């Protein structure tokens with residue numbers, strides 16, 4: 001297994017996302033080996049349902065000389081919003097498709113802003129439909145506009161790879177600069193510009209607490225899934241969230257009928273904690289390497305509000321709405337502040353909001369959450385920025 005990289009095509013409708021996706025898959029198959037996909041196979045995106053939220057996504061796979069890519073393409077504007085806000089497709093990089101004829105358009109800007117909000121780490125640009133523009137100064141002008149638009153949202157527009165091509169020429173089997181060579185140039189940009197994502201085992205240790213036990217003859221044990229890093233018996237951990245942060249030592253690690261020396265990312269296990277009582281640990285707190293994650297009550301978020309068809313509200317909510325925010329394992333009530341001038345949010349919409357929780361939660365930007373009322377999911381969010 002070589003590097004596996006998650007990517008996707010973003011950009012305004014009709015700018016050439018599905019055509020480019022089909023061209024990449026077909027040309028990589030012909031060049032490096034794999035399966036070719038045509039336009040109709042990718043334009044028809046299957047439906048996959050998870051928590052009532054319906055997202056239509058097309059998934060294609062293709063190989064570079066050294067990597068295997070998983071690529072997502074979406075039919076509608078709402079599909080891209082839901083896919084990016086939730087953790088459905090965790091893109092390691094996004095391919096921004098922009099038509100050289102019309103230039104950046106409203107959904108071009110929204111998709112860059114969304115990528116910033118949800119934490120898309122890198123963006124590569126395919127400047128498409130260059131077969132329709134013969135003036136190279138006009139191509140330069142639109143490229144400059146795309147780079148500046150990227151920098152407006154804190155992406156490094158001056159260093160961004162911008163590949164000029166015609167996804168339709170490439171899919172049709174054309175040669176020349178805008179044909180197959182341009183799609184191979186884009187694949188070479190994916191290989192050179194997007195690093196392999198850091199392994200969970202290499203990150204700082206983090207384990208959300210799911211259950212707590214007072215075991216007679218042993219002491220206090222917390223159970224959960226290790227999300228990141230490694231914890232060894234004898235090392236210190238912080239208990240972060242809900243209550244003031246405290247620090248203790250791990251004195252044991254175990255799985256069912258298996259005593260362990262350490263707990264590793266992906267493992268579900270129990271952790272024995274020195275000098276701790278059951279009332280000091282609780283669900284919704286996390287164990288973490290000391291000093292690597294901080295509790296917060298205030299944060300900004302990007303939020304998709306479920307439509308009534310997805311089991312959400314069928315009425316708008318107002319500024320000052322106080323639902324529950326479900327973080328990892330538990331609900332915390334929080335008050336919502338909308339952008340200035342915004343008084344209500346419609347179901348089916350996505351908005352940027354500020355939140356103040358009634359108790360702190362350990363969080364970094366990129367943490368996903370659900371918004372619930374009465375235990376019914378009414379929204380999905382991602383922490384865009386922690387307020388301090």
Ligand SMILES: Nc1nc2c(ncn2[C@@H]2O[C@H](COP(=O)(O)OP(=O)(O)O)[C@@H](O)[C@H]2O)c(=O)[nH]1
Nearest residue numbers: 013014015016017018019128129166167168169
């Ligand atoms: N002339 C030209 N047309 C293109 C190119 N790429 C896509 N198109 C056309 O633009 C229309 C929309 O393309 P599509 O891939 O469905 O755009 P999407 O909405 O972003 O997925 C289709 O009619 C394509 O054939 C190109 O490089 N040159």
Ligand SMILES: [Mg+2]
Nearest residue numbers: 017018074075
């Ligand atoms: Mg499409």
